[PDB]
């Protein structure tokens, strides 16, 4: 098989219908698509993408165009890994534990119970923020931990990690925006990779 | 003769002896033009296959 992590680009690069996406096959015509700019959710590459949805369902995610980040390319993960939100496991309503069973609940009741529990726990709480969060979402999680819980037990690392990692991120990464850039990568005479499979 | 001003009467009286022209819908519906834009219809080939290819051009 074709077998490339970037195969979808060919579908987007073909100037004709010769190469088509099997997932998108016969799904819609251009006029039937609501098209929006977007960013991929999957890795730190942050590629510009174009999400196309018909009938409220996302049908494809084209590569977009951002010369400073991704030129006009994707990987298959970014281009096609969008169905996760509609596989039928999505949480549609707030859920509450009662009698050991997870039951659908209102927003009012759910917030009541969550506030009760969190106030009962007070500072004996820790917030695992995970890595699937927008900058705003992470900021809200952190601020919520700092004030609403009066705790510093905040970690977005849902993965193997270490204290040395947090120390390094504080020392060199955090607060240091827009240093090395993709454009710089292209011209770096020598690139070394430590624990990194690009 | 002042009669011209009364021509309308001659009209209405005359019409009440010519036959009414109303179409008899629904017992006797009127003839709609052959080209009329009636309800869309999806057609088939003589073997029964649906003509529509789902191109969404319509
Ligand atoms: S058949 Fe498809 S690829 Fe060929 S001209 Fe028509 S739209 Fe383009
Ligand atoms: S398109 Fe591919 S490389 Fe770009 S952010 Fe998404 S998963 Fe990462
Ligand atoms: S335009 Fe295409 S989709 Fe619409 S009725 Fe004709 S063949 Fe079918």
TrEMBL record, chain A:
Amino acids binding GTP: 132
Binding site for [4Fe-4S] cluster 2: 14
Residues binding [4Fe-4S] cluster 3, per UniProt: 40, 43, 47, 75
Domain (4Fe-4S Mo/W bis-MGD-type): residue spans on this chain: 33-89
Task of the protein: NDH-1 shuttles electrons from NADH, via FMN and iron-sulfur (Fe-S) centers, to quinones in the respiratory chain. Couples the redox reaction to proton translocation (for every two electrons transferred, four hydrogen ions are translocated across the cytoplasmic membrane), and thus conserves the redox energy in a proton gradient.
Family that this chain belongs to: Belongs to the complex I 75 kDa subunit family.
Protein name: NADH-quinone oxidoreductase
Gene: nuoG
Parent sequence residues shown: 200 to 397 of 794
């Amino acid at each position: 098989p074709f077998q490339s992590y970037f195969s979808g680009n060919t579908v987007q690069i073909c100037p004709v219908g010769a190469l088509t996406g099997t997932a998108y096959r016969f799904r819609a015509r251009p006029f039937d698509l609501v098209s929006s700019p977007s960013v991929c959710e999957h890795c730190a590459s942050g590629c510009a993408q174009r999400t196309d949805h018909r009938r409220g369902k996302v049908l494809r995610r084209l590569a977009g165009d951002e010369p400073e980040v991704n030129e006009e390319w994707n990987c298959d993960k970014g281009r096609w890994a969008f169905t996760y939100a509609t596989v039928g496991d999505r949480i549609t309503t707030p859920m509450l534990r009662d009698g050991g069973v997870l039951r659908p609940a209102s927003w009012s009741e759910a917030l009541t119970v969550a506030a009760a529990g969190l106030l009962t726990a007070a500072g004996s709480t820790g917030v695992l923020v995970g890595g699937r969060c927008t900058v705003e979402d992470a900021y809200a999680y952190a601020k919520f931990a700092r004030m609403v819980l009066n705790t510093n037990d905040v970690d977005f690392r849902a993965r193997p990690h270490s204290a040395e990692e947090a120390e390094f991120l504080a020392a060199h990464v955090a607060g240091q925006t827009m240093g090395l850039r993709y454009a710089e990568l292209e011209n770096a005479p020598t690139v070394l990779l430590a624990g990194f499979e690009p | 003769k002042f009669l011209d001003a009364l021509a309308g009467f001659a009209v209405t009286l005359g019409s009440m002896f010519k036959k009414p022209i109303t179409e008899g819908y629904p017992e006797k519906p009127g003839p709609v033009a052959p080209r009329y834009h009636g309800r869309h219809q999806l057609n088939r080939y003589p073997d029964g296959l649906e003509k529509c290819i789902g191109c969404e051009l319509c």
